[model samples]
Target chain A: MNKQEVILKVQECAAWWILERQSKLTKLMSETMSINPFMTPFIFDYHSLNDFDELVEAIIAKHLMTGHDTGFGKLIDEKILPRVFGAYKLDKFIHPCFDEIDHVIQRDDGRIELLSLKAGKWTIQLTMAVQLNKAFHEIINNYPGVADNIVVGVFYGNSHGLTDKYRILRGINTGANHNVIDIRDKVHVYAGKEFWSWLNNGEAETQHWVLEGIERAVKEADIKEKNKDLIEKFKEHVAKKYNEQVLNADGTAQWHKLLEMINE
Target chain B: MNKQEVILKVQECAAWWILERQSKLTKLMSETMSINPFMTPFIFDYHSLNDFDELVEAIIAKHLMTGHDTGFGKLIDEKILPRVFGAYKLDKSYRAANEPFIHPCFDEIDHVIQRDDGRIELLSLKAGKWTIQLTMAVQLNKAFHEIINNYPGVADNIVVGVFYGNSHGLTDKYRILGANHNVIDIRDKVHVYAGKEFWSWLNNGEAETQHWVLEGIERAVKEADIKEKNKDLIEKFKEHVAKKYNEQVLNADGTAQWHKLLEMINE
Candidate 1:
C-alpha cells in the first residue's frame, strides 16, 4: 500500500478501534453507574474518553467494521500514545493500560515500590515506523535514554497469525542487545489478522518495554535473573485483574500467564 | 445476625445482586447493539440464549423485589431454578447433565470459552458471607456427596457479591482464589452486593426440582466423579478462554488450545 493508502487504512482502523474502545468504556460506565450511583457522575461527565469510545463504536457499526476496519488503526497509535502517556503520568488505570503497558517501579532501597505502567507492544515494522516518526518524538521528550538505557523487545500475543498464518511479515529487530522475544504461537493462539496488525503496528513495543524494565530491575536490584520469573506471575495477576474488570472468564488470565513464561 | 434478620438481609443482598447482574447485562446488550447491530437482535430475540440470560436475570430481579418486601417467597428458588435448567438444557454444549446444581458448566464455561465479544469478570468473593456461601456450596458438593444435591449453584451471569464490599465478615469461606494460585481481595474496589438470596436458602436444600433430565444429568456426571483433574483443567481453560474474549489485548483464536488443555488437564 502507498503512504496515503496506508494512512487511509490506518485512519479507518483508528476510527473503528477508537469506537470499540469507547463503547467498551461506556458499557463499563453504564454498568458501574447502575450498580453504584456514586460512579455515575464521574463516568457520565466525561465527553472525550467516554464519548470518544462511543464515537468510534458508532463509526465502526456503520462501516460493517471487522478487524481490518477497527483493529489496525494508525491514528489510534498516534492519538492513544500521547493520551496513554498522560494516563501514565496521572497514574490513572484506563483500559489496557495497566496490563499491556506499564512496568513495576521499585524504590531505590528496594523496600517500597510501585508499578510503573509505561510499557507497550509493537511489532518490528510498526516499531520502526512509529519510532522514526511520532514515537521518536515521545522518546525525545519522555525517555531520551530509551535506546541506551532500555532494551526494546516484542512478544507476539498472537503467534499463530505470524508463524502459521503468515498474516504479517517482518524481521525481528532487537537493537544492540537483541532482547526481542517472539512467543506468538507457542504460548498464545493466533489472534487473527486485525490483532496481528495492531501488535505489529506498535502495541508490542510497550510489552517489550516492560520486559526491558523488568530486566533492568532485576539487574539493578541485584536480584537473581530468576526474578524475571515474576513477570509471568505479574502478568497472571494483571490478566486476572483485567478479566474481572471486563467480566470475562478466568482462562484468559491463564493464557496471559502462559505468554509470560514464553517471554521468560 | 438472627435467622429472621439474616433471611431479610440475604433477600435484600440477593435483590441487589440480581439487579446489578441484570443492569450489567442490559448495559452490555445496549452497548453491543449500538456498536454492532448484530448484537441488537440477540438481546431482544426470544429464541436466542441471550433471551434465556435475560429471563434468568429478570426472574431473579423480580423475586428479589418481591422477596424482600413480602418478607419471603419461594419463587426465587423454586420458580426460577426450573427455567434456568431449561435454558441450560437448550444448549448442545452442556453435556454432563447431572452436574448442574454445583458443577461449573455452560454459563461458567461459556463466559470463559467464547472470547472475542464476551466480556466477563473473574469469579471472586467480596466478603466472608458470599465466600462462605460459595465455599459451602462447592465444598459441600465436592465433599460430602450426601449434603443434598438439590440446591442449584449461582445462576449463570449472576454476579458474586463477595467481590463487592457491602457485606462484612472474614473467614476461610470468604477468601477468593486467584490465577496466581493465591487468594486475593474482593476482585475489584466496589462494595455493591451481587448474589441471590435463593442461593443461600438452596444451599440448605429448599429449592424445587426443575428439569429432571438436566438435574439427572448433573447428578450422574457428578457421581461418575469424572476424575478430579478434568474439573481442574476445565476451570483453567475457561479462564483462558474468557481472557481471550473480554480483553481486546489478547488473541481471539484461542479456543483450540483451551479445548486441548481442557482435555489434557482433565485426562
Candidate 2:
C-alpha cells in the first residue's frame, strides 16, 4: 500500500476503536456531580450542581483516551509500519511481559533499530524505567550485535515537551558524578507531532492526518444506547427528593424538618 | 428563620471556615501512602505503579478529615450556635488534649459552652458518628468522669455532638461501645447527642437548629464565590503531588528500588 492507502486504513481502524469502546463512557454517567458543591461551594448552586461532572468525565476520558492512544500507536508500529515501509518486517522478539521493544526496524544499511513507542509524554516512573532496562539487557545479552540503536518514540509531543523524565529514561540527565548511570548514546527519544511527521519520512501534517482519521471516527456516529442508559440513571438520582416528612404545608422543602432527621 | 437568614450566616461562617483549614493543607505535597488496592487497573495492569499520584491524594484527604472536624466546631461557635448568647461563652482552649489525631486526644474534647447559670456543656464535637476509633470510647467514658470529678459543684453535661448521620448510622458502632465494650455510660449526665440532637443541645431543645446550620452551609457552598479558592487548593495540590512523585518518591530511579520502600515503611 502507498502512504495514502496506509493513512486511510489507519483512520478506519481509529474509528473502529472508538466504536467498540463506546460503552466505557458509562463510567462518568451517574451520581458524579452531587458532591462537588460540598467540595467547592463557590463554583455551584443547586441548579448548576451537575456542571462539575466534566472533571470526572475528563478524568475517565484520559484513561479511555490513553488506552485508545496505546492501541493506535501499536497500529502504527506493527500494522501501519509494514504498509508504509513495504520492507519493514515484524517480529515478536520476546514474550509480551519481558518485551521492552515495541517494534523492530531494519534500515537499508542492515542495522537493526530496537524501538519502544508510547502514547504521550509521561513522568516515566521508575518501575517502567527498570522494566525497560531489563528488556534491553536481556536483548543485548542474547543477540550481542543485533540492535545497533535503541529508540523510545513518544507519539505525541516534540523535543520541547520531552521533560527531565525523558532525560532520566535516556540515562542522560546530568546528575552528580556518583549518580550518572549514563546510557545516553544507546537510546534515542522522539516525541510529539514532529515525531509523527518524522515517522512518516518527514512528511508534514502526519498528526493532522491522524486527527482526520480520528475525526472521521468521531463523526461517523459523532458519538448511543449507553448514553440513554447513562442519562436515565443520572436523571433518577437528580430527581430524587428529600423525604416527604421534610416538606412544608405547600410541599416546599422544610429546613426545620431536616434538622429533626439530622439530630437523630 | 428563612432560607436567606440561614444561608447568609452559613456564608459568613464558610469563608472563615475555608481560610483557616486551607492553610493546614501545606503538607499536601508530601508523598503519603495508601495501601488500599481496591480500585485500580484503570490503564495499566497494576496498583501503585499506575496510581501513586491518586494514592497520595486519598491519604492526604483522610488526614484532612481532622481539619474538617475543626472547621465544623469553629462554625458552631462562630455562626451556628444560638447567636443570641445570654450567658454561654465558647472556650476552644479548654482542654490540653485538643487535637485528636496526634495522640489519643482524651475526651476528643473540641470545646465547651459554659452557661453563667452554673451549668456547663462539655462537648466533644465531630462531623460524623464514627469520629473516634472505637477503642477510644473506653477512654472517653473514663475522661468524662475525670471532668465530672473536677467540677463536683455544678452539673457537667458531657456530650458527644456529631454534626451528621442517622439512627442506623451509629447504633452499630455505639452499641459495640456501650453494650460490649462496657462503658458503664451516662444516664442524664453523659449525653451522646448526634445529628439533630447535637444541634438541639445548642439551640435550647429547638428542632429548627439543624436546618439553620445546614441550609447556611448548603447555600454558602453552592452560591459562594469561594469555589475558586477551594478549586485552587485541589488543583495546586495535584500539581504538587505530580511534581513530588518524581522529586522525593522516585528521585533518579535510585529510590525506585523496592528494598528501601519496604524497609523504610515497614521497619
Candidate 3:
C-alpha cells in the first residue's frame, strides 16, 4: 500500500479496535449487573452526614480516579453554568458558584449546601459530579412549595465497581439506592449497577470502563442536542486529536514544541 | 526525584518484578516435571505435533500480518548463515535468532541427527514414531547438553500460571528428562533426581528454597559475558535519538526529517 493508504488503514484499524473495546465494555457492565444485584450504581443518593461523607470519600478515591479531570471541569464551567440561567428551562431559581474553592446553591430559606471541587486523576469525574450536584440542587432548591427533604446526589466517573449500590439510612424509606441517569443518547441509560458489578467482578479492566461511560455520555449529550452531524464531527475531531497528540506524538518533542513556539 | 534518579528507580523496580515472576515460573515447571513425568511444559515444551504446528503458524501469521514478510528470510540469510559456519556457540546462536523468532535452538547429534537444520515446529510425530517426538525435538533443540542427561537445572521467564500440572516425558532409563537449563546465578551442580524431587514435593511460593534456586540462576546469567556496558551504551544512544526526534518534530515531518532530510539539518 502507498503511504496514505497505509495511514488510512492504520487509522481504520485503530478506530475499529477502540469502538469494539467500548462496546465490549458496555456489554460487560450490563452483563455483570444482571448477574450481581448487590452491585451499586454510578450515582449515590445521599441525605445524611454519615452516608454522604462515606459516599463522597469512596467517589473521590475510587470513582473520581477513573474519570477525566479535564472533562469534569469542562462539564461544569461550560455546560452546567450556562444551563443554570434558565437555559434548560427547568427552573429559574438556580444559581451556581464557579469559584475554584467551593461550589454551592442557596435556597430562599436559610438552608444552603455546598460541594467542594478538586482535580482528581480523571477530569470527567469532577465535571460529572459538578453537573450531577447542580441538577439535584435545582430540584431541591427550586421546589414549587415548602421543601423539607434534603437530598444530595454524588456522581463519580471513576468508581465503576461501586456505582450501582444502594442502602436505606436511618429514617430513610429505602436502602442506599443506585442512580440510573438517562445518558444524552436516550438510547440507553447509564446504569450504575452495571459499572459496580463489573468492577468488583474483575471485568472492569484497567479504567477502560470509565472511558466507555464518558463516550456513551458524550454521545447521549450530543443526541439530546438533536445534532447527529455535529456529534459525528466533534467525535472525529476528538479521535484525531487523541491519536496525534496523545498516542502518536513523539513525547518529549511534542512537549518542547508546545513550550518553544507559537504562531503569530 | 531527578530524571536520572527516576531512571535508576524504574530499572530497579523492573528487575525486582522480573526476578519475582521468574521464580514463580521455575516453581511451576519443577512441580509439573516431578508429579506427572508425561506432562508437557505449559508454553515452553510442546509434546504434541498439533501444538508444535500451532506455534509455527502463529509466528508466521503474526510476522506476515505486521508487514514483516521479509524478516524470516532475512534472518535465515544473515544471522543463521553466518553462525552455522561451525561456531556451534549455543548462547550466541540463540541470541542471533531471538528477535525474529520467539525461540530458536541448535540441535545436537544425539537429539535429531537427520534434519538438524530444519525448524523444530516442522517435525512430524507420525514419522518420528514416538509419543512425544515433536516435544522431544523442541526440548533437545533448545536445551543444553547437561539438561539432556537428566541433570537438574532451572528454566526462567515462563509466564506465571503457564504450565502447572503438565506431565514431563521420561527417557528410556525411566529417569526424568527435561529441558533443565539453570537460570539461577550459581556454579553449583544440579542433580536430576534432586531437581525432580524439589519440583514434585516443594511449593514454589513457599519462600526460602525457591528464592535460593531462582537467585542462583539469575546470578549465573549476570556473570555471563553478555557485555552489559556495551548494551547499556547502545540503549542510551537509542533513547537519545528517540527523545531528540520526538521533541521538535511532527510525526510526518519527523519521518521526512529522519529519512530524507537528515543531511540538510544536522552535520
Candidate 4:
C-alpha cells in the first residue's frame, strides 16, 4: 500500500478498536448486572436517567478517545515507522516526568529528542503552558547542561486547518510570560499532515498518504455507518429490566435488588 | 517585638496547636474504638506506641493546618476586615454561591464579601499547595459557573481571590480570572503576590495581617514547652515514618518526600 493507504488503514484500525472496546464494556455491564446493569445503583443514580446517561456517555467517550490514541501510537511505532524509517536505527523510551514529552527517541549520534504525541487537537492552554515551563525547569535543575540538548517535538493527529494550527503554534511559541521562564524556543509543533510526511520522508510532502490509508481501512472494515440503532435497543432493554427489578413500589430505586442483580 | 522573637512565638503557637489536636484525636480514637462504631473487625495492628504516635501526629498536623486556615479566614473576613474597612459597609456571604451564578454540582463559594457600593469579591482559602490543580480548577469553575448563570440584567461584579498559607509563613494572595462573556479566560489569572501590595489590598493598607499572625504564633510558641521536651522523639518518629513510607511507595528519587508523605497519610 502507498503512504496514504497506510495512514487511512491506521485511522480505520483506531476507530474499530474504540468501537470494539465500547461494545465490550457494554456487554460486561449487561452481563454483570443481569437486570438492566446500566440503571443499577453501582452504575448510576436512577433518579435522573438522562443525567446518569450523560455522565456515563462522557466517561465512555473519554475512554474511547484515550484507547484510540494508545492504539494509534502503537500502530505508528510498531508498523508505520518501521516500514518507512527502516534504515535509521531508532529507539524509544516511554513516559518520563512531564509526560508532555511523551517519549524519548534516541538518534544515531547518541543525541535524544523528546517526542510529544497528541491524538486530538493541539491547543495551548495557560495551564498546559505553565506545566511545560515548570517541567523544563525541573529537567534543567536535575540534569544540568542537558536542557539545551533537549529538542522537543509536538505532533498532533488532527488540526483546524493549517492556518488555525499555525496560529496556535505561534501562541505557544510566545510562552506564557507568567511562568517567569520562557522555553518556547525548545518546542517544535507539527500538524498531522506535516508530522507524518516529515517522519516518512523528512521533507514537506502531501497528506495524500494519510487520507488514502484511512479510506482503504474504512472500505476493508465496512465501518461507513454507526450502530446508533443498536445502542438505542440496548438502552431500552436495560431500562426495561431496571423498571421490572430495580425499582420499589413507591418508585424509589431498590439498593438490595441492584446488589442481588449483580450477584446473579 | 523583634523579628526573632516573633518567629519564636509563631513556632510555639504552631507546636502547641499541633499537640492539642493530636491529644484530642487520640482521645476520640480511644472512645470510638471502645464503641466499635465503624464495625471494623481488624484491630489497628499497632506494632509500637511510637508508630501509633507517628500516625496520629501526621493526622493531627493536617487537621491543624486546615483548621488554622479556616479560623484565620474567618478572623479576617468577619473581624479584621470589618474593623479595618469600617468606612465601607461590608456584608459577608459564607459557603453560598452568589445567587445569580449557582451551579448545581459545584461547591459553594468559600467566602464572598460585598460592599454597599456593589463591589464584590469571591475568596478561596488554602493552607498549602496540596492538590493545587484541583484547587485552581474549582475556583475557576466556580467563577465560570457564576458568569454563565448570572441573571440576564445583572452585571458581572464578582472577582476571585485565592489566599494561601505556606509552611509557617505569612499568607500570600493571588487573583484569579474574572468573568468573560465568550469563554472562561485563564490567561490573566496567573499573577501571584506575597508582597505588601497584596496584603495592603486585603487589609485596607492599615493592618499587616501576616505580621500580626506571625507575632501571635511566635508568642504562643515561646510559651509552649512541648516542642523543647519532645524534640528528639519527634525527629526520630519522622525519620522512622519516612523510611517505612519510602519503602512502601518506592517513589521516584529526588522527588519531594514531604509531598509523598502527605499523599500516603491521606491515602
Candidate with top DockQ is 2
RMSD of each: 25.7, 17.2, 30.9, 27.4
Report, to 2 decimal places, the DockQ of model 4. Answer: 0.01
lDDT of 4 by residue, A83-104 (tens): 4433222344223574445444
For model 4, what is the C-alpha lDDT against the true structure? 0.39
Once model 4 is optimally superposed onto the true structure by TM-score, how far is the C-alpha of residue B249 displaced, in angstroms? Answer: 52
Model 2: chain A TM-score against the true structure: 0.54
Alpha-carbon lDDT of model 2: 0.49
Model 1: residues >4 Å from true position, as ranges?
A1-209, A219-264, B1-166, B169-196, B200-221, B228-267
Worst 10 residues of 3 chain B by lDDT: B34-43
Evaluate every candidate with DockQ and list the scores.
0.03, 0.08, 0.01, 0.01
Q: How many clashes would you count in candidate 1?
A: 51
- Give the per-residue lDDT of model 1 (tens digit) for B1-267: 233333443344334433332233222333221111111121122112232233233222232222222221232322222232211221334435534533542232221111124532212223212335554545422332221222323322223333112233333343342122323333332122322222232222222221121133223233333233333432343343333234432235321222221122111
What are the per-residue Cα lDDT tens digits for candidate 1 across A64-144?
Answer: 222222332332333332232221122342333223223222223332111211112222353443333232223323432
lDDT (Cα, tens digit) per residue for candidate 4, span B171-223: 22122233433335444323233223334444444334445443454344445
Best by lDDT: 2
TM-score of each: 0.21, 0.40, 0.17, 0.33
State the lDDT of candidate 3 residue by residue for A131-199, as single tens digits.
554454444445434233322222222223332221111111224332323222211112222222221
Interface root-mean-square deviation for each candidate? 24.3, 14.2, 30.7, 28.0
Write down the lDDT of every candidate, Cα atoms only: 0.27, 0.49, 0.26, 0.39
Candidate 1: docking tier: incorrect
